[PDB]
Amino acid sequence: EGVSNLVGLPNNICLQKTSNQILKPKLISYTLPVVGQSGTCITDPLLAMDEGYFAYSHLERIGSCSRGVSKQRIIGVGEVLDRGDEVPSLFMTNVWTPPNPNTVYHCSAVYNNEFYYVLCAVSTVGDPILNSTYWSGSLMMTRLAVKPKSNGGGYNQHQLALRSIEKGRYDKVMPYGPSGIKQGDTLYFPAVGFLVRTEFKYNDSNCPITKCQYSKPENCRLSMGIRPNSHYILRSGLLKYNLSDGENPKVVFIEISDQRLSIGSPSKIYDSLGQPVFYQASFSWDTMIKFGDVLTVNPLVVNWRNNTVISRPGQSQCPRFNTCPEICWEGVYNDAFLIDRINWISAGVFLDSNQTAENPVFTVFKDNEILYRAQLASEDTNAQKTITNCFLLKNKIWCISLVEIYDTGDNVIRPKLFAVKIPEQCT
């Protein structure tokens, strides 16, 4: 009953490649018909769904989108319920706004027992990944919940002040990821550390230089940074938060294993049919999708499923279906939620265009094939970031996706919500 996570044995779905338009995505984000100009460009989205509780974060910039003053930083939490037609909807229950909107960047979310912990970064010099040699390093953590019990004390806004961050050998850590996992008394936020470039160990042998005659063998080393001549490289990983030990909890960092290592990017680890699956956004030469099963937690070993049918578009320098190393920190976030693990199938909103990001399509694909595709927008609609999270309805499976489509009705890149029903039977 209600909205639950993937735990157990759901209804069997179609296991055959079909293309007779078996998918029909609906929209659950009917926006107000704004008239005239907008000047309210929505950047930095966030969508984290866990145990029927969803979180949302977006920044409204006045004027342009890249260079625009911030107006309101909305951090919202809510429950996932039905829309009266067996279609899930996002009923946001609480909304908060920090005092300074131009200082909150790269938030996160996790739900352990009754709190939706939002882990953002405090920056007074600009963007964290853009300005790394001048960022302070302090992190912000807010305890948002559902049903704050108005006739009470501070159980609606409490912002936990982190004492100090204990880094093993890193300099600065920052939460870079929509959603993490919970393990009872330990929160795990997908984050990235700004490691010193002059103190990184990576032998120039593990680089995939099998058939890369046009490429250069020294491309793997100078690729984990935002720029070639950069002082801080992005090492993805997790932030462990022990809210059950000590008077005030602490934060530690655990890096990702060296197996198929890439640059730090918005990552997401999510539980499924038991174990957690980790996905790292392909913001590097590895245009192929990077996701796999997590074996261990402390050393963070994640086996990556080699998928060669789904890729990520670029900017005419590192297009889709590219494997050889190349210096290009250009990409978009396109996750893929694992549906069933008996046969590896993942559903995600990707971009079927080896060019500028256009034509978002919801693809449910197996290891190496394209099982089902759904076209939810015209081939001219532009996208910027796609987040997808699947869950269990009363008895079926439904996937909610936030897509940065070009709203033709308002002439602005607007985050819209879409609900996709997994086909139960091919017939």
Epitope: I28, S29, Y30, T31, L32, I42, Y56, H58, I74, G76, G78, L81, R83, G84, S89, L90, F91, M92, T93, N94, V95, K147, P148, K149, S150, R414, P415, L417
Partner: nanobody, 119 residues
Framework: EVQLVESGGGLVQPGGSLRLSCAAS????????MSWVRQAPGKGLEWVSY????????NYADSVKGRFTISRDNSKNTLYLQMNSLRAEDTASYYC????????????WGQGTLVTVSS
């Protein structure tokens, strides 16, 4: 399908009262949020009141704490937004929609109602 009508008018003198009303057809009104949102000409969406199910929690949009008071009724589907001591900074349009605030819209918004504070 789903119908949400926003009645009421405007053209009021700064300082007074206003009794807004809402309509609901389709979905169940007793089990959903059905909050209010405000849209000023030239500005974006501004949340003014959020009501949950049977009275447990009510957020009154701290920016305007004591000027507004939202009320719900499960017997007759109608969401009241009785305003008290309005000002000239409240000239905008009100919409009773599912979901607290932001950019998320569950169902179709609808026509709405215009409220003007002048003279």
């Amino acid at each position: 399908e789903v119908q949400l009508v926003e009645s009421g008018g405007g053209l009021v003198q700064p300082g007074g009262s206003l009794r807004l009303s809402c309509a609901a057809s389709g979905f169940t009104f007793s089990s959903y949020a059905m909050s209010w949102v405000r849209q000023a000409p030239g500005k974006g969406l501004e949340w003014v009141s959020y009501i949950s199910s049977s009275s447990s929690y009510t957020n009154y949009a701290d920016s305007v704490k004591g000027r507004f008071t939202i009320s719900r009724d499960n017997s007759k589907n109608t969401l009241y937004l009785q305003m008290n001591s309005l000002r000239a900074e409240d000239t905008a349009s009100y919409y009773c929609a599912r979901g607290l605030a932001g950019v998320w819209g569950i169902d179709v918004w609808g026509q709405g109602t215009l409220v003007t504070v002048s003279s």
